């Protein structure tokens, strides 16, 4: 379902979906299991480029997020047109050895030709078996 995220830009993200999660309830990310995410956003600029930057922290300490394609133009039709809406779907592979934590912060930032396209912070994710 739709999950709650905090916008760190200008409300370009319209919706974030995660099958099996809802609103601001704890969203369990299961180790060794695929995790599906969908985002719908409005382009705030014409841009040839969309570069995705993921910062993640476990118990207030930054951790590397593996298996992320930085070129968001791989998952939608670039160049982006200002004011058009783009739907991006991605399945992330959760490592079987992922550190179990009840305090996970994920910040996803998409940078365009002229600065930020989109920014969201998700604080409800919990990594469990």
């Amino acid at each position: 379902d739709q999950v709650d995220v905090k916008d760190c830009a200008n409300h370009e993200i319209k919706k974030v979906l995660v099958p099996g999660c809802h609103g601001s309830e704890p969203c369990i990310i299961h180790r060794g299991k695929p995790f599906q995410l969908e985002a719908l956003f409005e382009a705030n600029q014409n841009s040839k480029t969309a570069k995705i930057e993921i910062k993640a922290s476990i118990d207030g300490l930054e951790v590397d997020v593996p298996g992320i394609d930085p070129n968001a133009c791989h998952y939608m039709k670039c160049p982006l047109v200002k004011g058009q809406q783009y739907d991006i779907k991605y399945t992330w592979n959760v490592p079987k050895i992922a550190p179990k934590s009840e305090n996970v912060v994920v910040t996803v930032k998409v940078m365009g030709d002229n600065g930020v396209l989109a920014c969201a912070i998700a604080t409800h994710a919990k990594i469990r078996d």
Epitope: I58, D59, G60, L61, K100, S101, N103, K126
Partner: antibody
């Protein structure tokens, strides 16, 4: 028993750099965060930085960013502090803490390393 | 940067008295607050984690509480063994220690 063994105390010249080691025995840093904390004589505890070994790079207090490097695998952690000045004289400790997805504190402290910055 | 304001810096009380130490966080740290005791000439030792969870072996006189940015450590009946410096530490974002409270046991 889980024991963290640190490098022995030493004298470092001003402007030199020091690399303190923290070796785990009787267990590993897996399931734990590792932090480096300094205490100057007569002063309070100061967090230099920390890391989740094998899952992330060093995280640093902005006062110490760029002068501190912390690196770590499941059995060894290191703190390197460069451009040493007299104010860096302190006992340096390594300390573990259980990740929040596991039970118990997992709190263990090294014996501490007295670094004296002096000519 | 999350700042921890700990009060008082120094507390003097008699054996059997109830002492309370306060720690305020500059922003929300949820329940991610720890309390350490440092006895003189010794390494710090954990007393409380997750705001109210007692470490194994810590005496029942020690208790922890909080309002999400406001946290308190209570010793229900101060003992001579409790002479020490007590430090709060947030572990929600990075880690920050309070300035510490030196507890003097009089009488």
């Amino acid at each position: 028993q889980v024991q963290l063994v640190q490098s022995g105390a030493e004298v470092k010249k001003p402007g030199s750099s020091v690399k303190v080691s923290c070796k785990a025995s009787g267990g590993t840093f897996n399931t734990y965060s590792l932090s480096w904390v300094r205490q100057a004589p007569g002063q309070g505890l100061e967090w230099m930085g920390g890391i989740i070994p094998n899952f992330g790079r060093g995280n640093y207090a902005q006062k110490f960013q760029g002068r501190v490097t912390i690196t770590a695998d499941e059995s060894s952690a290191y703190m390197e502090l460069s451009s040493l000045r007299s104010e860096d004289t302190a006992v340096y400790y390594c300390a573990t803490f259980r990740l929040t997805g596991y039970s118990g504190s997992g709190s263990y402290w090294g014996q501490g390393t007295l670094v004296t910055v002096s000519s | 940067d999350i700042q921890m304001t700990q009060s008082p810096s120094t507390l003097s009380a008699s054996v059997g008295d109830r002492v309370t130490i306060t720690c305020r966080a500059s922003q929300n740290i949820n329940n991610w607050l720890a309390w350490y005791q440092q006895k003189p000439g010794k390494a710090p030792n954990l007393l409380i984690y997750k705001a109210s969870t007692l470490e194994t072996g810590v005496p029942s006189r020690f208790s922890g509480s909080g309002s999400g940015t406001e946290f308190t450590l209570t010793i229900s009946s101060l003992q001579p063994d409790d002479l020490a410096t007590y430090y709060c530490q947030q572990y929600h974002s990075h880690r920050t220690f309070g300035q510490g409270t030196k507890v003097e046991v009089k009488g």
